[PDB]
Structures are given as structure tokens and as C-alpha cells.
Design a protein around this ligand. Structure first.
Ligand code: HZP
Ligand code: HZP
Lengths: 225, 225
């Protein structure tokens, strides 16, 4: 059974464009500057992934929210709030494994590299613009996992039918993030001054708005070999 | 009773800032180039306004969505979806009257000039940025009602505690861009290319992202003289 990777089960996706593929196959690659094999898997519904992984992602996201430096959330989410938020449409999990499927009951604290969601950034007439939010497991910090996450995203977002990518709020203090977007030729299409009240900064911090055409992506960024 | 105009009854507003006033008083002014008197009224809760006015605004917003040229919505809203959308936080109705309160059972088709909502544009850490959407009654096109609505907005948004204004999608084909926002020194802080699929346009239409500092507003724009 391959229902777990069928685009026909894409929920709450773009209204005007159908997926370009009937399915999305796991995408294997090596972490940058390493022999460590990682695999990205599509998530079209939570029922196809281990409960324990969902609960670990729930906690992972709350820690990120509590640091108060990256997401506009102030308070932690409930389990159902997180399910509604992260998995409203599409998501991806990236694990340290060479398996082409996700094994139950793994040690997520070591095996989960990162996750991201993809959804429409706007209501239906502008729903060909996707948004994405990312997370890296802090145990795997410093391995350039984010860069890899961004690449999987460029490979897969167009397959769901999206034509353009928008990040609404990349804080200028979030250097990890904007350097990746800069390096991958995401345009800075906007700048919100004093946008975020962030933990650890006494003054409000500016956010950059990133855009990228998903129909003309540079082949070298799609390649993870 | 003045509950209907107390900022203490403000639902779902900014998280870090309190309102700058205890109350919001009706703002009276004349339509530009005319001796017609208009009154702007605050709406903190729908219970304070007439059912027939709410029903008229519901159908008015659905007409605008059906035109398919200005909002990202594709389908008409249900009644409850309208309530949740337009009155999630704060709203304003601007009537052709010199009364300083809203009389029941008026002919809204002639008396209602315009309405707009005001709400946080983002989750709590960035909720000092407010968003607004406007509606002009079609029967009052060509009387510069939008410009006046925009002036009411500059007067009232900061009173609720917002510090910066963001419009996410002003399509380049919407004349409000140059008839209003450009003229009131809303900066164009971003541009989303091919943002929207709009009725009557074959090519997707670009959308301007407008921002404006609400703590430092040109006083000639605040003045309704
Ligand atoms: O900037 C964005 O839109 C994503 C979602 C979250 O707000 C952080 N990054
Ligand atoms: O651009 C905005 O965000 C407001 C809401 C609607 O999209 C029209 N103007």
C-alpha cells in the first residue's frame, strides 16, 4: 500500500492547480559534509505516522515556541492545536535512516532530523502561494539540516501544485534562516519593520518576507548529491 | 449606557499593548467635496448593532467576493462564517447620518456607506501589527468613501493599541492602491508577483503589501476637515 504517499489524499491544498505527480517517493540523501544518510517522507495524514513521532513533534514545536525567537506564537499549543496547525495540509518528516518507510517506536530524539509543513499561504484565489515552517531537532544542530530541509521543500512544493513560495516572517535575528533563503535564491520581497516582540531582545525585531518562483527552480538546488 | 464603545470590551486584540483610550466616540465628518454628513461608529460586538445591519453587511461582503476582483476568497461565506470573519476583533460601520448612535431598521442600502474590520495580522508576538479590510457600498461609489474610511482607520487603530498596519494583498488592479494608500503614505513594503487569480483577468495579478507606522501619522491625514 502506497496510500500514505498519494497526492490524491492531499487535504486543504491549492484550489486552482492539481498536483504534478500522483505520488511523492521518499527522498534519500546524505547530510552535508557527512556520510550520514537521511530520508524525507511525505505526510498527507497523521494516521500514516507513528503516534510516538507525532507526540515527539508536538513537544519539539512547543520548545521552539518557548524559546520565543523564531515563531510568532507566545504560548504553547495543546495537542489538538498542534495537529490542526502542523498538519493542516501537507508536512514532511526527515529521519536519520536509509529505510524507505517509517518504522514505529524509534528513538526520535536521535532519529528525527527535522520537519516542515506546507500549506496555502492565503485563501483560494491566492492559494497557489504556499507557506512553510521548519524545525530542526536541537540534538542535530550544527549539521546544516535546515539547508537540506529547504531543498526537499523546493523538490516537493511544486509537486503539490504550488507556483510560488512565501515566508511571512523571517526575523532578521534568525540568521540561521535568512542565510539559507538567501543562498537558495529566495528573493526578499518585503520587509516588516519592528514586526516581532522576541524573547531576549529588548527592541522589536524586523521580519523579512521571502518569495520564490516554484516553476523555475535552479537545478543545482534541487540536487542533494 | 456606553458599553458599546468601551475598549475594555475589545475582543481578540493585540497581546502586548493596551488601548490608549477607555472609549471610542463616533467620528463625524463630511464626504469629500460635499456637505453630506457621515458618522463612523465602533463595533466591539455585533450584539450592539441591529440584526438587519449585520444581514445587509453579510450580503454586501458576499457581493464583493462574487465579483472576484478584490478579496482572496472564492466562495460566498455562510452567515456564521461572515460573523467569524468580519467581527473576529474590531469593526467599523460608517453611516450617512448625523446621529451619534445607530438607529434600528434603517434603509441600509442608502444609509450604509462603508465598513471595515481591524484585527491582529499575526499571532501574539507580532500582534501589534493590525490588518484591515474595507467595503464600500456600491451605491456610494464615486464619492471617495474609501479615502474617508481609511482616515477613520488611521484615527482608531492606534487607540486599540496597534503600532503598525499591514495589508497583505492589495492587487495592483485595485484602484484603492493609488487613490488611497499611496496618498496617505502607506509605504509599499513588498510585492507578491502573480499573487492572485482574479475574475476577468487571464494572467495572475500582482499584489502590493502595504505597511504604515501607526504611532507617527501625518496630522493632515488624521484631520477629517
Ligand atoms: O515565516 C513563515 O512564514 C514561517 C512560518 C512561521 O511563522 C515561521 N516561518
Ligand atoms: O490586503 C489585506 O490584507 C486586506 C484584506 C483583503 O485581503 C483586502 N485588503
Amino acid at each position: 500500500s502506497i496510500e500514505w504517499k498519494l497526492t490524491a489524499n492531499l487535504r486543504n491544498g491549492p484550489t486552482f492547480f492539481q498536483p504534478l505527480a500522483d505520488s511523492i517517493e521518499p527522498l534519500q540523501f546524505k547530510l552535508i559534509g557527512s556520510d550520514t544518510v537521511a530520508t524525507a517522507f511525505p505526510v498527507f495524514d497523521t494516521k500514516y505516522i507513528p503516534d510516538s513521532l507525532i507526540n515527539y513533534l508536538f513537544k519539539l514545536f512547543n520548545l521552539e515556541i518557548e524559546s520565543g525567537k523564531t515563531y510568532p506564537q507566545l504560548h504553547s499549543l495543546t495537542k489538538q492545536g498542534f495537529l490542526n496547525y502542523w498538519f493542516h495540509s501537507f508536512a514532511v518528516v526527515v529521519l536519520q535512516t536509509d529505510e524507505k518507510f517509517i518504522q514505529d517506536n524509534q528513538d526520535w530524539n536521535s532519529v528525527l532530523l527535522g520537519t516542515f509543513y506546507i500549506k496555502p499561504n492565503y485563501a483560494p484565489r491566492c492559494s497557489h502561494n504556499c507557506n512553510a515552517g521548519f524545525l530542526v531537532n536541537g540534538a542535530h544542530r550544527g549539521q546544516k539540516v535546515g539547508y537540506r530541509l529547504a531543498q526537499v521543500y523546493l523538490n516537493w512544493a511544486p509537486l503539490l501544485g504550488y507556483k510560488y513560495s512565501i515566508f511571512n516572517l523571517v526575523f532578521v535575528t534568525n540568521q540561521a534562516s535568512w542565510k539559507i533563503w538567501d543562498k537558495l535564491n529566495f528573493q526578499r520581497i518585503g520587509l516588516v519593520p519592528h514586526a516581532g516582540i522576541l524573547n531576549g531582545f529588548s527592541e522589536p525585531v524586523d521580519a523579512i518576507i521571502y518569495g520564490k518562483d516554484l516553476t523555475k527552480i535552479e537545478p543545482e538546488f534541487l540536487s542533494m548529491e
